[PDB]
Amino acid sequence: MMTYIVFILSIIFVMGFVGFSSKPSPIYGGLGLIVSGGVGCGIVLNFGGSFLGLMVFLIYLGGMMVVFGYTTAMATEQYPEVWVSNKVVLGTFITGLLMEFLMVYYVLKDKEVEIVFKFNGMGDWVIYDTGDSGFFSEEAMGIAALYSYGTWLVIVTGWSLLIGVVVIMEITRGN
Amino acid sequence: MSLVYMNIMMAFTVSLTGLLMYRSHLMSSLLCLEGMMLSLFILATLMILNSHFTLASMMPIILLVFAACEAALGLSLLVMVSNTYGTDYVQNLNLLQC
Amino acid sequence: KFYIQEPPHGSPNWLKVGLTLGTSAFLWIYLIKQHNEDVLEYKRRNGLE
Amino acid sequence: MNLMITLLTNFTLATLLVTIAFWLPQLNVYSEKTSPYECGFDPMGSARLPFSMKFFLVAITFLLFDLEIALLLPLPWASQTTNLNTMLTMALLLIFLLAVSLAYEWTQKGLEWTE
Amino acid sequence: MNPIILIIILMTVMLGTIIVMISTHWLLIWIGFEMNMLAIIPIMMKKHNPRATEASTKYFLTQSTASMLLMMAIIINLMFSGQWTVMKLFNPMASMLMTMALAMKLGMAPFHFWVPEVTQGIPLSSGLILLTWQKLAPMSVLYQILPSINLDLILTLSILSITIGGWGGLNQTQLRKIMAYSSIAHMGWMTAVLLYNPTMTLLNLIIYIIMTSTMFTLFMANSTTTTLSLSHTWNKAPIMTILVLITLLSMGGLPPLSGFMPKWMIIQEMTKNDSIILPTLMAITALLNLYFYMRLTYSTALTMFPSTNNMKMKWQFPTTKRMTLLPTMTVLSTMLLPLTPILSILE
Amino acid sequence: MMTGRQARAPLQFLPDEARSLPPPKLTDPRLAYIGFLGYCSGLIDNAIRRRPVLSAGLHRQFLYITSFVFVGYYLLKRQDYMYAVRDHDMFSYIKSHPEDFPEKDKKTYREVFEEFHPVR
Amino acid sequence: AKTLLHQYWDIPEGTECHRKTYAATSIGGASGLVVSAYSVALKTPTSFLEGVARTGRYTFTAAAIGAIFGLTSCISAQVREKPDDPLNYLIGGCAGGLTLGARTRSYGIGAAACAYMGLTAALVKMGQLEGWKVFAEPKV
Amino acid sequence: ARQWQPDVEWAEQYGGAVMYPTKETAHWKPPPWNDVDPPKDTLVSNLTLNFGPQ
Ligand SMILES: CCCCCCCCCCCCCCCCCC(=O)OC[C@H](COP(=O)([O-])OCC[N+](C)(C)C)OC(=O)CCCCCCCCCCCCCCCCC
Ligand SMILES: CCCCCCCCCCCCCCCCCC(=O)OC[C@H](COP(=O)(O)OCCN)OC(=O)CCCCCCCCCCCCCCCCC
Numbered sequence A: 001m002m003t004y005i006v007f008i009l010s011i012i013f014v015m016g017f018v019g020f021s022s023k024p025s026p027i028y029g030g031l032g033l034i035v036s037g038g039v040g041c042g043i044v045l046n047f048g049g050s051f052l053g054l055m056v057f058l059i060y061l062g063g064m065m066v067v068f069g070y071t072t073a074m075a076t077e078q079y080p081e082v083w084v085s086n087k088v089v090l091g092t093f094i095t096g097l098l099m100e101f102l103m104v105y106y107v108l109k110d111k112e113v114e115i116v117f118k119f120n121g122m123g124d125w126v127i128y129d130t131g132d133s134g135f136f137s138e139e140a141m142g143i144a145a146l147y148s149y150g151t152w153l154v155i156v157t158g159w160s161l162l163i164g165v166v167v168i169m170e171i172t173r174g175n
Numbered sequence B: 001m002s003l004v005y006m007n008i009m010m011a012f013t014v015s016l017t018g019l020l021m022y023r024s025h026l027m028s029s030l031l032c033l034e035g036m037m038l039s040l041f042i043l044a045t046l047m048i049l050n051s052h053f054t055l056a057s058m059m060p061i062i063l064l065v066f067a068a069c070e071a072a073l074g075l076s077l078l079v080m081v082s083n084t085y086g087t088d089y090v091q092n093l094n095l096l097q098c
Numbered sequence C: 001k002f003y004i005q006e007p008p009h010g011s012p013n014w015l016k017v018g019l020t021l022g023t024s025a026f027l028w029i030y031l032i033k034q035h036n037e038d039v040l041e042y043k044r045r046n047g048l049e
Numbered sequence D: 001m002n003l004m005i006t007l008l009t010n011f012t013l014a015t016l017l018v019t020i021a022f023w024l025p026q027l028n029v030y031s032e033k034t035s036p037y038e039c040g041f042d043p044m045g046s047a048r049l050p051f052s053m054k055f056f057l058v059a060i061t062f063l064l065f066d067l068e069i070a071l072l073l074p075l076p077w078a079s080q081t082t083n084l085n086t087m088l089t090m091a092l093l094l095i096f097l098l099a100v101s102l103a104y105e106w107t108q109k110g111l112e113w114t115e
Numbered sequence E: 001m002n003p004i005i006l007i008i009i010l011m012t013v014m015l016g017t018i019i020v021m022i023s024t025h026w027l028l029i030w031i032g033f034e035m036n037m038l039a040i041i042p043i044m045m046k047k048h049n050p051r052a053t054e055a056s057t058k059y060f061l062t063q064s065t066a067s068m069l070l071m072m073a074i075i076i077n078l079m080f081s082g083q084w085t086v087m088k089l090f091n092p093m094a095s096m097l098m099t100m101a102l103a104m105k106l107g108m109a110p111f112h113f114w115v116p117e118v119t120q121g122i123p124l125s126s127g128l129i130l131l132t133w134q135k136l137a138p139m140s141v142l143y144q145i146l147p148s149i150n151l152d153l154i155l156t157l158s159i160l161s162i163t164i165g166g167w168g169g170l171n172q173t174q175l176r177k178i179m180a181y182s183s184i185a186h187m188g189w190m191t192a193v194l195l196y197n198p199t200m201t202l203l204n205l206i207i208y209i210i211m212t213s214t215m216f217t218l219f220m221a222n223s224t225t226t227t228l229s230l231s232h233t234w235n236k237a238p239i240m241t242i243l244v245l246i247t248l249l250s251m252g253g254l255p256p257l258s259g260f261m262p263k264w265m266i267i268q269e270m271t272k273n274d275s276i277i278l279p280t281l282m283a284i285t286a287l288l289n290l291y292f293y294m295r296l297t298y299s300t301a302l303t304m305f306p307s308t309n310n311m312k313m314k315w316q317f318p319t320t321k322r323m324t325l326l327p328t329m330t331v332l333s334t335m336l337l338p339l340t341p342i343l344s345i346l347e
Numbered sequence F: 001m002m003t004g005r006q007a008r009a010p011l012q013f014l015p016d017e018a019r020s021l022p023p024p025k026l027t028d029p030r031l032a033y034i035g036f037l038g039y040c041s042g043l044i045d046n047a048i049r050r051r052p053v054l055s056a057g058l059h060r061q062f063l064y065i066t067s068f069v070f071v072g073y074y075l076l077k078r079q080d081y082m083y084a085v086r087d088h089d090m091f092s093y094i095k096s097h098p099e100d101f102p103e104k105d106k107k108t109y110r111e112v113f114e115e116f117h118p119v120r
Numbered sequence G: 001a002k003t004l005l006h007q008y009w010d011i012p013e014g015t016e017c018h019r020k021t022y023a024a025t026s027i028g029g030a031s032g033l034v035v036s037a038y039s040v041a042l043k044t045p046t047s048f049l050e051g052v053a054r055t056g057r058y059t060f061t062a063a064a065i066g067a068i069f070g071l072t073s074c075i076s077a078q079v080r081e082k083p084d085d086p087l088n089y090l091i092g093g094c095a096g097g098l099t100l101g102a103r104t105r106s107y108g109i110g111a112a113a114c115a116y117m118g119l120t121a122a123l124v125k126m127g128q129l130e131g132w133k134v135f136a137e138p139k140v
Numbered sequence H: 001a002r003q004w005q006p007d008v009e010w011a012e013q014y015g016g017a018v019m020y021p022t023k024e025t026a027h028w029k030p031p032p033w034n035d036v037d038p039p040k041d042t043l044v045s046n047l048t049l050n051f052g053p054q
């Protein structure tokens, strides 16, 4: 069953999304989002985008670390809930996992499912291309074309980031 | 379509129904926002890498940048809240009901 | 002298008055010139001379 | 194929060194040894209290700066394009905007710690 | 706030709205929306009181959810079309998600909950800037994707917004909540006629912007926030009472004022397509907006409410505020009916 | 509506086809009404600042009515151009598709039959 | 909800009372479910039992109104041999209004609901007869 | 004989946060005049550390 490797990684992806979207406590939500980011970078690395996966992994690890510092600082409780300390959190986690595995079982039986779009049941390895790409990877040249072509995108993004820095300075002032 | 598309869309819907029902904590909603952003990023780069649209590879990473352009902003909208009240509960944000 | 303090509009602002009069005169002569050239070019196009 | 094998091997070697460290020796657990350590005296309060941070502004600045320099990472590959003047101008503009943002943070006393 | 930083932030807001208006790429639309939200957040945090923090938090959460839905619909359209041209969509689910996102961005009911609270928690300058300028980009995006919106969804949203705004405007004494509910009702009025002829939608947008700006600027000049100070305004300057009376009579859709300009012609576009029940219901519901406008005029101008002793000192100090374009804006909002075919320039 | 018509040459206030139309006269009644709007604006500007409304700032009222006349004249030019475009497009489509707009006979009242409903 | 209205409207009037009554009951139950869902969303009940009691009460009230309206309309259409006549729908609307008054345990609400829902049902039958459109497909 | 003009009874109806009060809208105080609330300073909870003998 090694041909469904991306499908298994996506199953772990939705599992982690169910794990942190039930909102037990932001520490374990951060752990679930770290796991989800890892399997997501694995998925996009399996599709060939190694640079994009490594970049999103690094960015979300840094963001989740700053988040963890914030929740240790500010959003804390005397008795944090791991997953089973609250009935509603454990309940919604259980139904999320149950719905995910029900969808897995249904798509693994007749190889077809209808949830609002229509989806197949075969592994994604069919939709790959059969030819080679020469002496370059397409994603690397595509992101490297940001400076040679996307001047407007670079300008508006740099202005947005500078304005964001100014906004962060202005909001947390107090007077 | 395929299968991983279905799984990523299911993850997006899971994070959406996680976001829309708050649990008296702002950081959890911010984590849900980051999760939906991650799911959108993964779906976009999956479609782009499948369809060999190379010139759109500038799209997702640039997209990821604007994630912080709200996400860090959300943290800056929390500290004043955590200076107004001792905690960050969303039930304390009910002064604008009159 | 009546007021115990100097009003900010006690004397007319001469530069503002001159700017207003110049702007009004320039706009009037520009509109007249534009209308004259418009009606002349309209008569040229249709040949209604 | 090899990367997950290496990951599983290292994970197995790490996780075997605790079950060896647990089930091997003679254990003697009472309700005085496993108390939290606070230099011989019992602590006041809990360790789950709000730990009021000071460098929140620099944390948000790092949140922006990590990805705003991650935009600068394809600059090696961007040296291989035919159009070079535009690439050089855009890269210099990006790092100049980074420097302007850092200088604005520095001048407005944003890097200093609160209280 | 430093004036240089304020000018830079306002220019960033204008640049974001312009970027949404002039771009031919969906990613640029989303980038402009994000820049607009990021640069419009600290305007509401101008005075640094807690109510600004609640208003900013609620606005940020709603706008972030709307932006997420917009980007999801954009990605689905990319999947089903393989392009990025800002035009009609090729998936009904993407059209539904974009309509929901733009309804949340416009504050249209049943996504109207944040509008009166955000409007009440922020000053009058940020409130005017929000309720007038921030309602330009989503209307342009709705203008661009005209052959894609489901008719039933947008019509249900319009009638729901009109009814909910008309019902909600009755039970308010704060002026900002009244303006927010009026904005919701006008939002429903503009999106009711969008699929038939968007020139009437642009006309209604221009008229609504002019009247809302006039009312907000009169509120600046009188320095009023509640109904009681607006009533008290008759002692300081009766000309302001005359101006707010004729303006509130204009916004009630009463001829021969310019507020009868959009609505009437909106009806003129619904009967040509054989829809007679909906404009009748919409006018009957706009009677409620006329009702609380009449209540405001009764409190303010047509009756002489009691005042206090200290207002005597305010008789010795004339107004020195920068009432920018107020007489021109009042004249435009009141006496624009006989120039009705001017709207032909909007085609 | 005419958006595709404004597709090849966008962001033009008055194209090259707008100059073949007769410009509005300076004695147009709509232009006089817009000048009266400017005069009303000048009166309100004098009134809201506690000035004598018929004497204070004659240059201000003159600039008000001048700017109003300028903008109104250009807007009226654009409106006339757009209505000419509408009529031209309608007549061109009527001429281009004769089968979709067939002529109908004009029966005299000696041939057509109308039911009579008495009032009594 | 498109299939429910189409299921109710394709049954001939005054022919099968039970299927029409069941379809009207389903329509009323769906509307009551929507109303109760919004009620328990915006106004939080103090307990789960109170919430499910309110949901059941709203659904039962709306289902009873719809069932009695459909039964009375079909009975009137069978008794009068006038299937395409709005007066049967007026009678059914007044019967539903009396049901609403009985459920609310008041008389003035029953009379007002009779009048207004009879006018609304007569207007609905009028629009179905004349082919009126409420959400008109744009054509010009 | 004079023209009737409103007193404090007619003017005090609009002085509330809502026009028609209900059971739910019973504790709804009006907003402050300057919209600036008192800071409601809670206990800051400075953490107590035992720099102990060991
Ligand atoms: C002052 C209090 C009392 C006020 C009473 C006012 C009049 C009462 C009736 C008004 C009905 C609404 C206007 C109808 C105009 C019809 C024009 C027309 O072409 O009709 C033919 C058109 C025909 O449709 P069509 O023309 O689209 O279709 C082509 C023609 N056929 C049908 C042959 C294919 O009729 C309609 O479209 C429907 C007309 C009925 C509308 C019912 C909904 C409104 C109900 C009344 C609400 C009144 C206000 C209540 C609140 C008052 C304030 C408290
Ligand atoms: C509960 C807590 C967690 C408990 C479990 C912890 C497990 C270990 C966690 C630490 C390791 C995380 C690893 C995350 C993914 C790293 C990807 C990587 O290392 O990629 C390197 C390399 C990219 O090089 P590339 O350019 O693709 O070369 C191809 C041309 N020769 O890639 C290659 O050359 C491709 C090699 C095969 C790749 C297969 C697809 C990815 C496999 C991912 C496995 C699962 C990762 C889970 C991470 C969880 C993190 C919390």
Ligand SMILES: CCCCCCCCCCCCCCCCCC(=O)OC[C@H](COP(=O)(O)OCCN)OC(=O)CCCCCCCCCCCCCCCCC
Pocket: D096, D099, D100, D102, D103, D106, D107
């Ligand atoms: C056009 C050139 C390229 C410009 C863009 C690229 C820049 C690359 C480097 C980026 C630097 C980022 C950070 C800059 C911060 C400057 C503002 C600042 O913090 O000034 C403070 C400092 C005085 O220190 P103090 O106030 O005590 O600081 C608090 C704690 N130390 O103030 C100072 O020490 C004075 C700083 C300003 C004067 C510097 C003069 C340098 C001259 C070098 C030789 C000539 C170079 C000619 C080029 C033009 C220079 C303007």
Ligand SMILES: CCCCCCCCCCCCCCCCCC(=O)OC[C@H](COP(=O)(O)OCCN)OC(=O)CCCCCCCCCCCCCCCCC
Pocket: E125, E126, E128, E129, E132, E133, E202, E205, E206, E209, E210, E213, E217, E220, E321, E322, E323, E324, E325, E329
């Ligand atoms: C089909 C698409 C059509 C698009 C048309 C676009 C037209 C141009 C853009 C119009 C949109 C609104 C622009 C202005 C937004 C609000 C600006 C604002 O609030 O400025 C604040 C300023 C404060 O002044 P001050 O009293 O000194 O300060 C108090 C302390 N805060 O000042 C004020 O509070 C006073 C008000 C200043 C601005 C009034 C005039 C501009 C807005 C009304 C439009 C007037 C008619 C011109 C445009 C017609 C078409 C809309």
